[PDB]
Design a protein around this ligand. Structure first.
Ligand code: NA
Ligand code: NA
Ligand code: NA
Length: 327
DNA sequence: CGGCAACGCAC
DNA sequence: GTGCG
DNA sequence: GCCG
């Protein structure tokens, strides 16, 4: 879908990025949703009233949209802190968010070399810094495929019945991916247990995993690994890789969650909410039991969902293919 | 005005 | 408990 | 920022 409001959305993206790097995530979110709507509008926006009519665009956003449209500029841009470029630079380091970026900036740091030479770094941040360039690039989906096949080969050697699927943007069909998230499970509902640890060991022994950001995270019955991998061969770059092992009964909800996108997951959680349910990476459940003070006193009950279609069905929604889940 | 999800891990 | 993804 |  052609963007008939490019000059507009271009200036709005710069402002949104400013808010995002300085910590105002909620304000940045609002901009991102409004920007999406603009890029996909059938024609160049021509009036404030019309702008206001689009879902996601309120008075404030319409006010800026019309300003750019009629004046060609957005004055709010000329008042952006000069620090934004550096705050984005620092926040591009895996493990370093806005607060850390802010702190380093207040210490006078301005470049990556400054960081490497004078900044205090967590273990995760040091790995993120040393792979700065590799991690900022989006890999061709062809490489993500090789990464997924590598994990799957190691996994299936332990149990040929395991089901492995790369999620994230890869599953949504994008030509390039910022990372690879391999979701692993077993149809018999129990054989996924005792795989996670030895799978990581096997991949580590074979030289595929090069650094661990979080060797193991236990979220209910789900086990997650966050790390760094590199395919064999000269010229290969280091890439971000997550491996998640889950019980079959939660496979559909895990698939949906890790496939995303982050915006799609938000709309689905909100929608589940309007229907007295909650949707997480674990399951689709009925609303939690609350007391006189609207406080969690008892978990809602899990509504079994064998496949993603079941989740949409129970939510009264038409099924949506992964490629259609950017928003 | 408050919600926009909730959570685990590193520190 | 803060920060991060 | 947007929305109820
Ligand atoms: Na600003
Ligand atoms: Na970061
Ligand atoms: Na507010």
């Amino acid at each position: 879908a052609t963007n008939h409001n490019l000059h507009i959305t271009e200036k709005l993206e710069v402002l949104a990025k400013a808010y995002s790097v300085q910590g105002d995530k909620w304000r940045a979110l609002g901009y991102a949703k409004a920007i999406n709507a603009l890029k996909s509008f059938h024609k160049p926006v021509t009036s404030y009233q019309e702008a206001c009519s689009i879902p996601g665009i309120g008075k404030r956003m319409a006010e800026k949209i019309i300003e750019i449209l009629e004046s060609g500029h957005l004055r709010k841009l000329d008042h952006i802190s000069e620090s934004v470029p550096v705050l984005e630079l620092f926040s591009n380091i895996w493990g370093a968010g806005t607060k850390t970026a802010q702190m380093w900036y207040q210490q006078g740091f301005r470049s990556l070399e400054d960081i490497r030479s004078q900044a205090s770094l967590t273990t995760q941040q040091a790995i993120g810094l040393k792979h700065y360039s590799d991690f900022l690039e989006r890999m061709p989906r062809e490489e993500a495929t090789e990464i997924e096949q590598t994990v799957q080969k190691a996994a299936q050697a332990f149990n040929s019945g395991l089901l492995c699927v790369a999620c994230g943007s890869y599953r949504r069909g994008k030509a390039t991916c910022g990372d690879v998230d391999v979701l692993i499970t077993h149809p018999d509902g129990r054989s996924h247990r005792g795989i996670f640890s030895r799978l990581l060991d096997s991949l580590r022994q074979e030289g595929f995993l090069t650094d661990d950001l979080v060797s193991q995270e236990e979220n209910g019955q789900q086990q997650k690994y966050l790390g760094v991998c590199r395919l064999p061969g000269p010229g290969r770059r280091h890439r971000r890789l997550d491996i998640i092992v889950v019980p079959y009964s939660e496979f559909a909800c895990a698939l949906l969650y890790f496939t995303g996108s982050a915006h799609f997951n938000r709309s689905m959680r909100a929608l589940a909410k309007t229907k007295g349910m909650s949707l997480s990476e674990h399951a689709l459940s009925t609303a939690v039991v609350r007391n006189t003070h609207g406080c969690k006193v008892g978990p809602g009950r899990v509504l079994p969902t064998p496949t993603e279609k079941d989740v949409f069905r129970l939510l009264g929604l038409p099924y949506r293919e992964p490629a259609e889940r950017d928003w």
